[PDB]
Amino acid sequence: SKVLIVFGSSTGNTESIAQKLEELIAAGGHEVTLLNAADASAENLADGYDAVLFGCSAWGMEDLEMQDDFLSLFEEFDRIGLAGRKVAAFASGDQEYEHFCGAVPAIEERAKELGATIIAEGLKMEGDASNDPEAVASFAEDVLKQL
Ligand SMILES: Cc1cc2nc3c(=O)[nH]c(=O)nc-3n(C[C@H](O)[C@H](O)[C@H](O)COP(=O)(O)O)c2cc1C
Known part of the structure; x- marks a missing residue:
């Protein structure tokens, strides 16, 4: 299967999880594409992919709850081509919020x-991929069961 992992990361944490997921999911035999949301154009973004994984860190303040680069993309969700495709979401954040x-x-x-x-x-988890390999590995297995 083909998986697109698009992430919005401001300090590299979610970016981290996204690399890890790609790693685990490619070890499952699948083609993975990793995309920074700062580089993504919503229009037809999902063309060709069997599944799309969305990463987005949490930022309560100034920012309209989402990571910068991801808010610009999320607001164009209906342009992506998500009808009929498999999707899942992951984030890095902080429980103290x-x-x-x-x-x-x-x-x-x-x-x-x-x-x-x-x-x-x-x-939903805190820190980077290495902060919680068990949480990342579960997410991956769940996705890999639907591929
Ligand atoms: C300005 C500020 C606001 C934050 N707001 C939230 C939030 O409300 N919810 C949450 O779960 N985490 C919040 N956090 C925690 C960050 O999202 C956390 O550091 C996360 O791991 C960053 O992910 P990223 O490096 O991939 O962008 C906040 C952190 C900062 C410093």
Whole structure:
């Protein structure tokens, strides 16, 4: 299967998780493409992919709850081509904040509204990939079960 992992990361944490997921998922035999959301154009972004994984870190303040680069992309979700495709979401955040990884449920929410099938429980965790390999590895296995 073909997987696109698009992430918004401001200190490299979610970027980290995204590299790890690519690693684990390629070891599962699949073609993976890793895309920084700062470099992504929403229009037809999902063409050709069997599954799309969305990474987005949590930022309660100034920023309209989402990571910068991901907010610009998320607001164009209906241009991506998500109808009929498999989708899952993951984030890095901090439990000490009132709303922990709030982008997770919204990504799942909008995707599903645009006709995508959510294939794994959304990953909410703190730090980078190495901070919590067990959380990353579960997310990956769940995705890999739907590929
Ligand atoms: C300005 C500021 C606001 C934050 N707001 C939230 C938030 O409300 N919810 C949350 O879960 N984490 C919040 N965090 C934690 C960050 O999202 C956390 O450091 C995360 O790992 C960063 O991910 P990234 O490096 O991939 O962008 C905040 C951190 C900073 C410093």
